Amino acid sequence: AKRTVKMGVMGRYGTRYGANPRKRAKKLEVSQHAKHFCSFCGKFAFRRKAVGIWRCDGCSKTVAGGAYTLSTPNNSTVRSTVRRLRELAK
Amino acid sequence: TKALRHIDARLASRHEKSVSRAYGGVLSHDQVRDRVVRAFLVEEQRIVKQALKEHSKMKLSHKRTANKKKS
Amino acid sequence: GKTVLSCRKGNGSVYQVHGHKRLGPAKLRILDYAERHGYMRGVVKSIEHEAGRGAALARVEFRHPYKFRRVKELMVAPEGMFTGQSVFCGQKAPLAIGNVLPLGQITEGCIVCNVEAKPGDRGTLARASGDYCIIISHNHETGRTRLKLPSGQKKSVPSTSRAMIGIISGGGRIEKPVLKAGNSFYRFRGKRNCWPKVRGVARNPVEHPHGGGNHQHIGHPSTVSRHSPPGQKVGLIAARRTGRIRGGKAVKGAW
RNA sequence: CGGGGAAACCCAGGUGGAGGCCUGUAGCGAUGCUGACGUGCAAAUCGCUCGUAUGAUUUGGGUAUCGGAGCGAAAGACUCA
RNA sequence: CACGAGUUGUUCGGAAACUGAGCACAACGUUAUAUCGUUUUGUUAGGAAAGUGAAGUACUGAAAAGGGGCAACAGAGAACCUGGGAUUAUAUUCCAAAAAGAAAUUGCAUGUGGG
RNA sequence: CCAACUGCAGACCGUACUCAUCACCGCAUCAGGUCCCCAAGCAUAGAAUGCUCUGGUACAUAGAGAAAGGUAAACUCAGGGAAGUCGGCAAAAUAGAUGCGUAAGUUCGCAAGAAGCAUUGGCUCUGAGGGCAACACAAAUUGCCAACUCAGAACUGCUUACGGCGGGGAAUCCAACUGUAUAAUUAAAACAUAGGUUUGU
RNA sequence: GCACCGUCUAGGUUCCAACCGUG
RNA sequence: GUGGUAAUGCGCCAGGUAACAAAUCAAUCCUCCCACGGUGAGCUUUCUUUUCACCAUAAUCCACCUUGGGCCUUUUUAUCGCGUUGUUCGGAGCGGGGGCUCAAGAUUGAAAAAUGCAGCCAUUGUUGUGAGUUCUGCGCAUUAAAGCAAAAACCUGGGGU
Ligand SMILES: [Mg+2]
Ligand SMILES: [Mg+2]
Ligand SMILES: [Mg+2]
Ligand SMILES: [Mg+2]
Ligand SMILES: [Mg+2]
Ligand SMILES: [Mg+2]
Ligand SMILES: [Mg+2]
Ligand SMILES: [Mg+2]
Ligand SMILES: [Mg+2]
Ligand SMILES: [Mg+2]
Ligand SMILES: [Mg+2]
Ligand SMILES: [Mg+2]
Ligand SMILES: [Mg+2]
Ligand SMILES: [Mg+2]
Ligand SMILES: [Mg+2]
Ligand SMILES: [Mg+2]
Ligand SMILES: [Mg+2]
Ligand SMILES: [Mg+2]
Ligand SMILES: [Mg+2]
Ligand SMILES: [Mg+2]
Ligand SMILES: [Mg+2]
Ligand SMILES: [Mg+2]
Ligand SMILES: [Mg+2]
Ligand SMILES: [Mg+2]
Ligand SMILES: [Mg+2]
Ligand SMILES: [Mg+2]
Ligand SMILES: [Mg+2]
Ligand SMILES: [Mg+2]
Ligand SMILES: [Mg+2]
Ligand SMILES: [Mg+2]
Ligand code: NA
Ligand code: NA
Ligand code: NA
Ligand SMILES: [Zn+2]
């Protein structure tokens, strides 16, 4: 059975700290504890150790970035921009 | 390799802490294999490019410079 | 009266940095002959976290230019760096995330981090997590590059200054509410002795300008002059305006 | 893992053991009796009752900051009655 | 209160011999005044702080950036165990050749085998 | 040159006793204060609380003994039940476990042990919950053995009977919450807090 | 004005040589 | 220096040990209880094949079954199989057949009965089951905007001597 109607992980806080702060923190908490996709391996294997550090469960890879998710939206834009500018250079 | 403390490690025989293979007691067998393969393949790949470059420079030696000559 | 807390903190004493668990300072490598004329290739060996800092650090291994040995560097890592990656530093280096180039070789519109204001200072601008600079334009007659800083100000630097390509890792750190006093306690445990904070109106007149009275209030304007002596300069120091900001929000700092 | 649904998802039974969570020892404190004592056992103690008790927790040794100075989750608190 | 006695270690704790939060001799600077400041973010000082193996009987003279030292009897480190009919009182410290006995470990020398 | 065997040698300081209702600090052999290790049996959820073998102790000035009035980590009280008092202060009171059952409000987590109803002893029985040994499908059976919990039945009894262990409900004011805090008359509505905003750079 | 201090180079091109280039 | 297809067995520079957290589940030594047996003592009007005590084995060495990890080689797996109390593993090699290693136990001996204990120159001399215990193993996923000291000393290799 479901055990909760919409509190999820934040059920550990009981009735403390207010509804909107709890709802805002829950979104980042779920992402921080999820398994993310490793493009080197081809499987869902990246876990966060400390803020900004992501380690693969099977292969020995460690990656930097994000603090609550593996990749931030600004970084993808930066990647495409860098690749296109380098394509112009070469 | 065994797990030995300070005096026991000092007083044990050498092969208690190593194996006869290269890098024995430092690297595992898969790491050793990968190093051997990588060394051979990279050296060969470098040789090919050096040869190609030298062959091109020798190609433009008795070519138009020594073929379409002018003095 | 007695000494005010903001002045007391300048003696050092129990308010210095908690540094025992930190690794060394984070810097680029030294601007030597190899970097001025060719390039150097290093390998990323590990990605780690240190207490007090939001960004991740990278240990990078190079070969020594003059001796038979290995040299380990500790840098602030950009987003996307991974263990086993090759890193190129020097004059002729390709445009890729993590490489280090002179500013005069990076095309306009590119996003950079770890920028040195003066050549050879090994990186001083755009280092906090998630931050970066934008390259605006070059000037070949005077050899100077224009940059847009994280604060929104513009700065001109010599075109021989170096910068890493990318964005500092660990971004988005401040968007999660803290919710608990204990979380703040653990956050400042790794930095220094500055929390919790007692309001000045809650103190007594002997130790703060705002203290005293039969109600909790400041009985005088809290905007103070730039020329006030220490112990008098508390409140809103040399403020150009106060109150809620409406419309465009201006760039802070000096002109 | 069972049942329902065209789908999106919904209902139910277990497993697991989170929390500046609850009751309660040791520990750390000190609400009420305006109790005892008030030439005291004691220049602040005793009894019962009571707060907290996985945390912004308690504690040994070492080390660092003082006299118009130090230190203070701020009472003009504390710096060998 | 008086008189007379009692504490035994190659291995137990410390030191010899680690590094920590830290301290501050030298050096340099400052002060009418050193009884002041700096001195671990790899590290003193406008700063010439290295005294050695090896080769060839002490001698002699190539390499090795970043002076000397202190700070933990709960961190690191550390080769020994039981039996005793062995005290008035000490004992993993004492016990005598059947050492009640059985070990481990460091230095330097013999010889036996191998280099 | 390399074990291993053998011979000789193995320096320095500490070591008694104490660690506390008499060996330390508090003017004292002062009901105060003072870090670490070992930790038995039965009841029971148990480092709660009560009693006990090993080890320890009978030391804290005593004897005789119905005044009034006191102190208590001491009890009862017909009928009434807060009329007492500034004020239910103090005392009484509730109570473990198991089944059923549970309102307004709500940040959906709670409120909640909400409130409330019922059972519980002793004795003699019954059922359920296991282990390992001996292409063909009821070894779907033979033997041996442990450890305790839960459920159901008959008979039989109460003087309601150790310890230990929440009283409950309806509302107003203040502060969001856990926390801190006038050592020796003030623990709060004060301070802190997460959250919000402004300033310098 | 003329001497002298006054010199060597990877590469790119067209045997030398020359023009570029600048360690 | 030398064996095995292999995992791996035998005679200046670079890494490693020192060196580091939670819970869960198993836990060894040791403690407690029970069953069976031997020795001493207690009670006995009666009853009690009874009640109580004891039944011990240090370091250091020799030789070489169980559990839990990592791996090799052969047969090549798939919607599917393997496994935990528990939040998972597999063509980057699952399962089966044979092996190689590491950790922790066990079992032989030596030491060692010549000792210790208890009745009295003689007797005795113990083997099984539950429960509790943090060593240890579950290898290095506790909150975390918290991510968990350092060095001496020592070990192995790469190079040349
Ligand atoms: Mg500092
Ligand atoms: Mg005040
Ligand atoms: Mg004033
Ligand atoms: Mg106010
Ligand atoms: Mg609590
Ligand atoms: Mg409690
Ligand atoms: Mg006041
Ligand atoms: Mg005397
Ligand atoms: Mg230091
Ligand atoms: Mg020094
Ligand atoms: Mg020392
Ligand atoms: Mg020690
Ligand atoms: Mg010793
Ligand atoms: Mg004695
Ligand atoms: Mg003694
Ligand atoms: Mg004691
Ligand atoms: Mg006393
Ligand atoms: Mg005294
Ligand atoms: Mg007790
Ligand atoms: Mg009534
Ligand atoms: Mg009345
Ligand atoms: Mg009246
Ligand atoms: Mg009362
Ligand atoms: Mg009830
Ligand atoms: Mg409050
Ligand atoms: Mg409170
Ligand atoms: Mg007070
Ligand atoms: Mg009070
Ligand atoms: Mg307030
Ligand atoms: Mg554990
Ligand atoms: Na009183
Ligand atoms: Na008890
Ligand atoms: Na009455
Ligand atoms: Zn991966």
| SS3 sequence of C196-209 | CCCCHHHCCCCCCC
Phi, psi of C230 (to 5 degrees): -60, 140
State the binding site of C for Mg(2+).
193, 216-217
Smallest CA–CA distance, residue C25 to chain A, in Å, is 19
Q: Where are the beta strands (DSSP E) in C35-161?
A: 39-48, 57-63, 70-76, 86-90, 100-102, 111-113, 133-139, 144-148, 154-158
| Residue C243 at interface with chain A, using a CB cutoff of 8 Å | no
Helix, strand, coil shares of chain B, percent, nearest 5, are 65, 0, 35
Pick from C130, C174, C124: which is nearest to C147 by CA?
Answer: C124
CB C79 within 8 A of CB A71: yes
Peptide bond into C158 cis (omega under 30): no
B1 C-beta less than 7 Å away from strand H = yes
C24 C-beta less than 7 Å away from strand E = yes
Q: CA–CA separation, C152 vs C155, rounded Å? A: 10
Q: Residue A21: closest CA among chain C residues belongs to which residue?
A: C177
Nearest neighbour of C166 by CB, restricted to A63, A78, A85: A78
Provide CB contacts within 8 A for C38, sequence distance 6+: C90, C91, C92
List CB contacts (< 8 A) between A61 and chain C. 82-84
Question: Tokens at residue C92, please?
Answer: 């002729």
In the block, tokens 């593996």 appear at A70
For residue C129, with 0-12 CB atoms within 10 Å meaning exposed, 13-18 middle and 19 or more buried, which class applies? buried
Residue C37: nearest nucleotide (C-alpha to C1') = G23
Q: CA–CA separation, A60 vs C44, rounded Å? A: 13
Question: What residues pair up with C88 in beta bridges, in sequence order?
Answer: C41
Query: Known binder of ligand: residue A56?
Result: yes
Question: CA at C77, C1' at E59: how many angstroms apart?
Answer: 59
Q: CA–CA separation, A5 vs C248, rounded Å? A: 42
CB C5 within 8 A of CB C210: no
CB C236 within 8 A of CB C224: yes
Q: CA–CA separation, C15 vs C194, rounded Å? A: 7
Question: What residues pair up with A88 in beta bridges, in sequence order?
Answer: none
Pick from C110, C108, C84, C109: which is nearest to C97 by CA?
Answer: C110
B66 C-beta less than 7 Å away from strand G = yes
Q: CA–CA separation, A64 vs A35, rounded Å? A: 15
C49 C-beta less than 7 Å away from strand H = yes
Question: Tokens at residue C76, please?
Answer: 């602030």
| Residue C201 at interface with chain A, using a CB cutoff of 8 Å | no
List CB contacts (< 8 A) between A68 and chain C. 172-173, 175-176
Question: What residues pair up with C146 in beta bridges, in sequence order?
Answer: C137, C156
Q: CA–CA separation, C8 vs C12, rounded Å? A: 8
Q: CA–CA separation, A54 vs A64, rounded Å? A: 6
Pick from C200, C227, C231, C229: which is nearest to C216 by CA?
Answer: C200
List CB contacts (< 8 A) between A89 and chain C. 95, 107
Provide CB contacts within 8 A for C3, sequence distance 6+: C207, C231
For residue C57, with 0-12 CB atoms within 10 Å meaning exposed, 13-18 middle and 19 or more buried, which class applies? buried
Phi, psi of C96 (to 5 degrees): -150, 155
Provide CB contacts within 8 A for A10, sequence distance 6+: A22, A23, A25, A26, A29
